[PDB]
Paper text:
TSG-6 is a 35-kDa (single chain) protein composed mainly of contiguous Link and CUB modules that are flanked by N- and C-terminal sequences of 18 and 29 amino acids, respectively. TSG-6 was shown to play a direct role in the transfer of HCs from IαI onto HA via the formation of covalent intermediates (HC1·TSG-6 and HC2·TSG-6) and act as a catalyst in this process. Hyaluronan is organized into a cross-linked network by the cooperative action of three proteins, inter-α-inhibitor (IαI), pentraxin-3, and TNF-stimulated gene-6 (TSG-6), driving the expansion of the COC and providing the cumulus matrix with its required viscoelastic properties. Here, we have determined the tertiary structure of the CUB module from human TSG-6, identifying a calcium ion-binding site and chelating glutamic acid residue that mediate the formation of HC·TSG-6.
To test our prediction that a functionally important metal ion-binding site is present within human TSG-6 (37, 85), we determined the crystal structure of its CUB module to 2.3 Å; this was based on the crystallization of the human CUB_C domain (i.e. the CUB module and the C-terminal 29 amino acid residues), which we had previously shown by NMR spectroscopy to be folded. This revealed it to have a classical CUB-type jelly roll fold, with a greater degree of similarity to the metal ion-binding subclass of CUB domains (C1s, MASPs) compared with the non-metal ion-binding spermadhesins, and, consistent with this, it contained a divalent cation at the site we had predicted. The metal ion-binding site in the TSG-6 CUB module consists of seven oxygen ligands with pentagonal bipyramidal coordination geometry. This is composed of the main chain carbonyl groups of Ser-234 and Val-235, monodenate coordination with side chain carboxylate groups of Glu-183 and Asp-232, and bidentate coordination with the carboxylate of Asp-191 and a buried water molecule, an arrangement highly suggestive of Ca2+ (or perhaps Mn2+). However, no magnesium ion-binding sites were discovered during the refinement and analysis of the TSG-6 CUB module structure, despite the presence of 200 mm MgSO4 in the crystallization conditions. Overall, these data provide evidence that Ca2+ is not required for stabilization of the TSG-6 CUB module fold but rather plays a role in the local organization of loops surrounding the calcium ion-binding site and perhaps also has some effect on the stability of the protein core. The Glu-183 residue, which is involved in chelating the Ca2+ ion, makes a major contribution to the non-covalent interaction with HCs of IαI (e.g. via their Mg2+-containing MIDAS motifs), which precedes formation of the covalent bond between TSG-6 and HC. In particular, it probably orients the functionally important Glu-183 amino acid residue, allowing it to interact with the HC.
Numbering used by the authors: 131 to 249
The structure:
Amino acid sequence: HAKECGGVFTDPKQIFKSPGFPNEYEDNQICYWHIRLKYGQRIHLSFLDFDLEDDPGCLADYVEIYDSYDDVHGFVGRYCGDELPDDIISTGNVMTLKFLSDASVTAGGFQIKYVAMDP
Ligand SMILES: [Ca+2]
Ligand SMILES: [Co+2]
């Protein structure tokens, strides 16, 4: 139980896993993680593991990161393949992660850490 993932996260620190990790993710997976810390705090995001389906535009499988509390504002990047994306630091107290896999081809998945940064 199961292909369940995401929600809102307000703790100082957490490691997000792709559903099933360390098993490969499944097809047709969508997950949203919304990080919200205290006003004045920022988010240091780091990639422990990253292995998704690869294609030139990441049109199939991807993890998207937003420097905001939605998946509309402050788009920082879209990632796939087996390269570890560089660390991401938020400009504010909010960050949004979206994972999507399409109908075919799976890979190892990911573990992504965030930690609070104080002023
Ligand atoms: Ca796929
Ligand atoms: Co606007």
